[PDB]
Design a protein around this nucleic acid. Structure first.
Ligand SMILES: *O[C@H]1[C@@H](OC)[C@H](n2cnc3c(=O)[nH]c(N)nc32)O[C@@H]1COP(=O)(O)OP(=O)(O)OP(=O)(O)OC[C@H]1O[C@@H]([n+]2cn(C)c3c(=O)[nH]c(N)nc32)[C@H](O)[C@@H]1O
Ligand SMILES: [Mg+2]
Lengths: 14, 734, 50
RNA sequence: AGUAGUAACAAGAG
RNA sequence: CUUCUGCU
RNA sequence: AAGCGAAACGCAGCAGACCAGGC
């Protein structure tokens, strides 16, 4: 059930 | 092929051979700029002086075979002389003109494709629309704005990766394209740059311009989008605004952001009105975003936001009741909460004022790669169930949930160099800074969050700080579901007169109290078309225009204040200003100012034009009697509480007596006409509630007193009080 | 290296208006001065030395 | 002479 | 003399 | 929301006697 996330302003963790 | 022949020839020469053999590729970067010519320290004079000599330009030695040494008039186009420090010959500007006149022509269909950044400007200016020019008191605030929007789906690295791959496919190196966007752009550029003889450096520079995002600090008054910043000089002036609508399509994110800012300003302004629903409907029908009426935009753009949804409910559309936070769409399924500012100390000793939410609440978070069910209380995460598709997604969702919790254990987990104020010293959103910091590094937060035992439940698996799942231990109130979590749906709602949205069962879904208090800036310029054209402007503009309106209508305002002040206070022109006065102190300030005006009217004479102009906007809200004495009145401006001093001049509100001019926040508001009825005669009567300022102290009635201590006086007695900027004055209690 | 260290330190100092430039400098100065004037007590006389 | 002003120019290097 | 130069 | 230099790499056993001791 792939879904979007509307507004977003984040990058990937490490 | 001739490059190898040139290399052989260079090898033949002794000095050149030694240079080529000894200098490594690493050393090339240093010898590449090894010159004797020092940078001109006065280029204008040198250019003006050199244009007079015969051969000021330098051209490639090849020109000698491409241009005759002299034209039909005998003027020498070039000279056999060699430029000092290179093989370029020295030529006159006649050579440039001759080349442009009858030089070798070539096809130029590639230029619009390679210079797309420059040609798009012309293309969008050609289709631009110009509205009326309105003269106003423009208040341009300095902030960072977009010069080159770049590509929204590519970062610096992604842009360079495409650039290199498109311009220098062989020199790409070990880098590899890893995104559908990068592949599509690379394919399109390669298809467009077929048989392009333009210098590769220019192609790379133009591609960098078009792709890498660039921002600069500019004094803006309208939209901050690139389509608007480029024409900033034409649109926003010092005393006028030119309604302009740039051609082409606009980014959906810019429209969504602009709509959010406009809706938030509209609800914040309509909340202090007598009929909030009617005011909101009128504002929404009059407002336009980038030349498009907000009325028709709300019916096509969801932009889930505590203000957008409200506006939609007012308009009758079905709302989403959802808000986006950290890339996750949160839907409050149950519970309610109330905002309140709280002072906290982070792990790096910084102190912040975060908007803590009180009350138990339950949310559903939907993300591009995760979905979670969250249940939180006041600064505490009760439970969280994540259903992310990937381990990285699980980590991202958990970090967002922890930051959203606002738990003290997370605030204390902040470590290293984290700044809550930018280089311009502006106050950033603490939640966003925390989210960014913890997404950059979450090891410390996971280590300090805490661990709890797991109740064995089918389908629920715990997760440990090292990200490996466990069945016996897990992070405090954290579970991972492998079966998925359920879904977006719009529910019709009813909105009452006071903008309190309720569902079919009467449960209140949205209220104006939860709308964000941050006064942001719109990406796309917002235009208002009512008599009070500054109704939905920012704080500084609202203050300056409010006082300007008061001064312009002073000949009537004075009569109304002297005759029917109760009806004057209810004038709609003061409602936007009331939007900036704190909600808690609104009634106190209104009651205090109303009493001060009444006492000034009772005491014959003592009329003070400057005091009336300064305090009139604070009387609009309903009175709330109190014994409190205010030395200054606070108004919110972009998160800062500006203090207006009741007595005297302050930088926020100043009256220059020499020029008889009023300045608000440094912006001129107008001149005050000479009033024969003023007659101050020393006594003020408008500084303290129930007390008259007699004048200079005399060291007889008392050494000194405080503003609150003055309440001890019963009646008639005179005493010295220290009121204002260290100015002790004699006062009398009625 | 010494200038790089000083620049890194100055970026964290509110009163240091050197590393920034252009409108960014004017914005920093306006914000800083504004806050300084604000936090000042209403009963305290204020003066500016230039 | 003049420019100009704390020291130059009023050509200089072959 | 002629050659070279007007930021070196 | 933000933003600067605007190749190649987890051992191993005697066994068989006899004695003393353990519940
Ligand atoms: O860039 C701005 C904003 O544009 C104005 C933009 N933005 C929001 N939504 C969208 C969108 O859908 N599409 C686009 N393109 N842009 C969008 O996001 C930025 C937000 O900036 P800012 O105004 O500083 O954020 P703000 O609105 O003030 O608050 P924020 O921190 O993001 O919080 C968002 C909502 O979450 C509420 N909230 C936070 N917490 C911790 C809680 C909580 O614990 N309980 C409840 N009930 N609510 C919480 C915030 O109050 C706010 O309502
Ligand atoms: Mg036994």
């Amino acid at each position: 059930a792939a879904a979007a996330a509307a507004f977003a302003a984040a990058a990937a963790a490490a | 092929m001739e490059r190898i022949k040139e290399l052989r020839d260079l090898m033949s020469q002794s000095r050149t051979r030694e240079i080529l053999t000894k200098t490594t590729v690493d050393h090339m970067a240093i010898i590449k700029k090894y010159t004797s010519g020092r940078q001109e320290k006065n280029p204008a004079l040198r250019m003006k002086w050199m244009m007079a000599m015969k051969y000021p330009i330098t051209a490639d030695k090849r020109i000698m075979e491409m241009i005759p040494e002299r034209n039909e008039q005998g003027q020498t186009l070039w000279s056999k002389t060699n430029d000092a420090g290179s093989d370029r010959v020295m030529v006159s500007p006649l050579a440039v003109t001759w080349w442009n006149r009858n030089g070798p022509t070539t096809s130029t269909v590639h230029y619009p494709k390679v210079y797309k950044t420059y040609f798009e400007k012309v293309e969008r200016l050609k289709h631009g629309t110009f509205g009326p020019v309105h003269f106003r008191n423009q208040v341009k605030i300095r902030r960072r704005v977009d010069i080159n929007p770049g590509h929204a789906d590519l970062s610096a690295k992604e842009a360079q990766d495409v650039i290199m791959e498109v311009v220098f496919p062989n020199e790409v190196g070990a880098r590899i394209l890893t995104s559908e966007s990068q592949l599509t752009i690379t394919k399109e550029k390669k298809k467009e740059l077929q048989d392009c003889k333009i210098a590769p450096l220019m192609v790379a520079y133009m591609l960098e311009r078009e792709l890498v995002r660039k921002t600069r600090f500019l004094p803006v008054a309208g939209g901050t989008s690139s389509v608007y910043i480029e024409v900033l000089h034409l649109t926003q002036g010092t005393c006028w605004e030119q309604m302009y609508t740039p051609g082409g399509e606009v980014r959906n994110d810019d429209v969504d952001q602009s709509l959010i800012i406009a809706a938030r300003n509209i609800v914040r302004r309509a909340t202090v009105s007598a009929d909030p629903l009617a005011s909101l409907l009128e504002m929404c029908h009059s407002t336009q975003i980038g030349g498009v009426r907000m009325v028709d935009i709300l019916r096509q753009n969801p932009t889930e936001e505590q203000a957008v949804d409200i506006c939609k409910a007012a308009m009758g559309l079905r709302i989403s009741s959802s808000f986006s936070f950290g890339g996750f769409t949160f839907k409050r399924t149950s519970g309610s909460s109330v905002k309140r500012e709280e002072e906290v100390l982070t792990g790096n000793l910084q102190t912040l004022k975060i908007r803590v939410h009180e009350g138990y609440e339950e949310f559903t978070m939907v993300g591009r790669r995760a979905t979670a069910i969250l249940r939180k209380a006041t600064r505490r995460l009760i439970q969280l169930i994540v259903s992310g598709k990937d381990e990285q997604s699980i980590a991202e969702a958990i970090i967002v949930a922890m930051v959203f919790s606002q738990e003290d254990c997370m605030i204390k987990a902040v470590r290293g160099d984290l700044n809550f104020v930018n280089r311009a010293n502006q106050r950033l959103n603490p939640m966003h800074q925390l989210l960014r910091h913890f997404q950059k590094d979450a090891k410390v937060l996971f280590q300090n969050w805490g661990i709890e035992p797991i109740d064995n439940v089918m389908g629920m698996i715990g997760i440990l700080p090292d990200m490996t799942p466990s069945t016996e231990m897990s992070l405090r109130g954290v579970r991972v579901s492998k079966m998925g979590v359920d879904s977006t749906e719009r529910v019709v709602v009813s909105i009452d007169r006071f903008l309190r949205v309720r569902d079919q069962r009467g449960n209140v879904l949205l209220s104006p109290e939860e709308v964000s208090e941050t006064q942001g800036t719109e990406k796309l310029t917002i235009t208002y078309s009512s008599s009070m054209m500054w109704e939905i402007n920012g704080p500084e503009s609202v203050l300056v225009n409010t006082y300007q309106w008061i001064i312009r209508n002073w000949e009537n305002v004075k009569i109304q204040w002297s005759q029917d002040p109760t009806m004057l206070y209810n004038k709609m022109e003061f409602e936007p200003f009331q939007s900036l006065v704190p909600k808690a102190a609104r009634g106190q300030y209104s009651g205090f100012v109303r009493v001060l005006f009444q006492q000034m009217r009772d005491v014959l004479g003592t009329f003070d034009t400057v005091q009336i102009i300064k305090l009139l906007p604070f009387a609009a809200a309903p009175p709330e009697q109190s014994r409190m004495q205010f030395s200054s009145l606070t108004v919110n401006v972009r998160g800062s509480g500006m203090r207006i001093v009741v007595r005297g001049n302050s930088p926020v509100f100043n009256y220059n007596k020499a020029t008889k001019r009023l300045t608000v926040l440094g912006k001129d508001a107008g001149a005050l006409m000479e009033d024969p009825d003023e007659g101050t005669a020393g006594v003020e009567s408008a500084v303290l509630r129930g007390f008259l300022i007699l004048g200079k102290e005399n060291k007889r009635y008392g050494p000194a007193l405080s503003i609150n201590e003055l309440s001890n006086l019963a009646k008639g007695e005179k005493a010295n009080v220290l009121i204002g900027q260290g100015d002790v004055v004699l006062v009398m209690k009625r | 290296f010494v200038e790089a260290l000083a620049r890194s330190i100055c970026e964290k100092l509110e009163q240091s208006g050197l590393p920034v430039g252009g409108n960014e400098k004017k914005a920093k100065l306006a914000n800083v001065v504004r806050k300084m004037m604000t936090n000042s007590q209403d009963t305290e006389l204020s003066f500016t030395i230039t």
